[PDB]
Amino acid sequence: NPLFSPYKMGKFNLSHRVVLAPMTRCRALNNIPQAALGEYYEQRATAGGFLITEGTMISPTSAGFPHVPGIFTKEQVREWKKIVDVVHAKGAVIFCQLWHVGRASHEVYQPAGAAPISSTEKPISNRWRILMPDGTHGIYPKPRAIGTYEISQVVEDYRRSALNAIEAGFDGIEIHGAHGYLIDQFLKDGINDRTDEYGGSLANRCKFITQVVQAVVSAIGADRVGVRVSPAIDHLDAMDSNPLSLGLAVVERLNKIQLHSGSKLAYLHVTQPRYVAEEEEARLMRTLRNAYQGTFICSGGYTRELGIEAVAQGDADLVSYGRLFISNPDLVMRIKLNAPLNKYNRKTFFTQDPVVGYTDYPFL
Numbered sequence: 620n621p622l623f624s625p626y627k628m629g630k631f632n633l634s635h636r637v638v639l640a641p642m643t644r645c646r647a648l649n650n651i652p653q654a655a656l657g658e659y660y661e662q663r664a665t666a667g668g669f670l671i672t673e674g675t676m677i678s679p680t681s682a683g684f685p686h687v688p689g690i691f692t693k694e695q696v697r698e699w700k701k702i703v704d705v706v707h708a709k710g711a712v713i714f715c716q717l718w719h720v721g722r723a724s725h726e727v728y729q730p731a732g733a734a735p736i737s738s739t740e741k742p743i744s745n746r747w748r749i750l751m752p753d754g755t756h757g758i759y760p761k762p763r764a765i766g767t768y769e770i771s772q773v774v775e776d777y778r779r780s781a782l783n784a785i786e787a788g789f790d791g792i793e794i795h796g797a798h799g800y801l802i803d804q805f806l807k808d809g810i811n812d813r814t815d816e817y818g819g820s821l822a823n824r825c826k827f828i829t830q831v832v833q834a835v836v837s838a839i840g841a842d843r844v845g846v847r848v849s850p851a852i853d854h855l856d857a858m859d860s861n862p863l864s865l866g867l868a869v870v871e872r873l874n875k876i877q878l879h880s881g882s883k884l885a886y887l888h889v890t891q892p893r894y895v896a897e898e899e900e901a902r903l904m905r906t907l908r909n910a911y912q913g914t915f916i917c918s919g920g921y922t923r924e925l926g927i928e929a930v931a932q933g934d935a936d937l938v939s940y941g942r943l944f945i946s947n948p949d950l951v952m953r954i955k956l957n958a959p960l961n962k963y964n965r966k967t968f969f970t971q972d973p974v975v976g977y978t979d980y981p982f983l
């Protein structure tokens with residue numbers, strides 16, 4: 620089974636290639652990591668296995684879901700440290716995903732009820748609705764388009780959050796540059812209508828992600844930084860006229876950052892365009908993998924068979940699993956044994972209970 624051959628992800632010696640994909644679960648009450656998160660990640664940790672956390676706030680304006688953790692305060696750092704310690708005791712490697720939602724937010728999630736921030740004034744359309752803290756669904760508002768001073772402040776928020784992640788004991792961080800969130804709102808020409816140095820051309824649209832990645836690489840080292848993108852995705856009105864060219868432009872910049880830094884990033888993590896909340900889709904994935912000088916993690920709709928094939932055929936080095944990892948704490952072992960998998964319950968993906976639908980899915 621190729622999923623159980625070891626893999627050197629830079630300095631990290633992994634014993635298998637099954638990765639816990641980053642998943643927002645909304646148990647981090649008041650944006651503080653809770654003991655429940657420790658039990659959840661401990662359940663899923665394996666010796667030499669790689670885990671990526673739920674998206675984690677970099678600042679008070681970065682959230683668009685209820686009860687998602689932050690890593691911008693010392694209180695949050697202190698509580699993450701307990702979670703990281705229990706995962707490390709199982710021998711796992713764990714990265715914290717740094718997440719800013721940009722315009723995918725609501726007044727209820729913003730300090731003082733202010734407008735969310737974005738590259739543009741364009742709102743997500745009413746085809747999409749935002750989950751509210753009471754379980755109803757609301758309307759995405761018009762965001763505020765930020766200037767270059769505020770852009771530099773957001774870059775600094777990523778940099779400080781990366782340092783805070785290292786202080787908490789994380790092995791590294793992942794930049795959430797995917798899925799129509801803040802970074803993708805700069806990348807995608809269906810969103811970014813700017814006329815300054817951050818829009819107007821593909822090169823300008825890539826400026827923001829480039830600066831974010833350079834800042835975190837400078838702070839913690841390239842080998843502790845992963846980057847997630849999704850150039851082709853049906854999520855929150857985040858479309859590009861040329862997804863493959865957009866992806867390749869991002870890859871070129873990551874390759875150049877590595878050459879400048881003298882070290883490779885931890886990895887590039889790419890969402891299969893099939894995933895929502897063909898050979899054109901497989902065309903895109905393999906084209907980006909072949910273009911990138913480093914470790915490639917694929918995600919989105921993978922199964923045991925599809926993950927085996929991806930690694931066997933050279934399409935990916937690591938395979939991240941989301942939904943099946945929700946309901947199978949021992950997913951790694953089940954994949955190794957080809958054991959039957961448990962169903963997952965969408966109704967408890969984003970509820971707040973520390974146990975129900977979170978840590979009470981059974982082991983084999």
Ligand SMILES: Cc1cc2nc3c(=O)[nH]c(=O)nc-3n(C[C@H](O)[C@H](O)[C@H](O)COP(=O)(O)O)c2cc1C
Binds near residue numbers: 918
């Ligand atoms: C409930 C849920 C929460 C998710 N949260 C995040 C997130 O916070 N950050 C992110 O990059 N992807 C997130 N994803 C996407 C997953 O990381 C992953 O790519 C996807 O679940 C893989 O497809 P699969 O569920 O078929 O394995 C989430 C997915 C689900 C189902």
Ligand SMILES: CCOC(=O)/C(=N\O)C(=O)CC
Binds near residue numbers: 643797798854895896
């Ligand atoms: C569909 C692609 O977008 C995602 O997977 C995602 N976050 O990145 C969420 O669903 C947040 C809960």
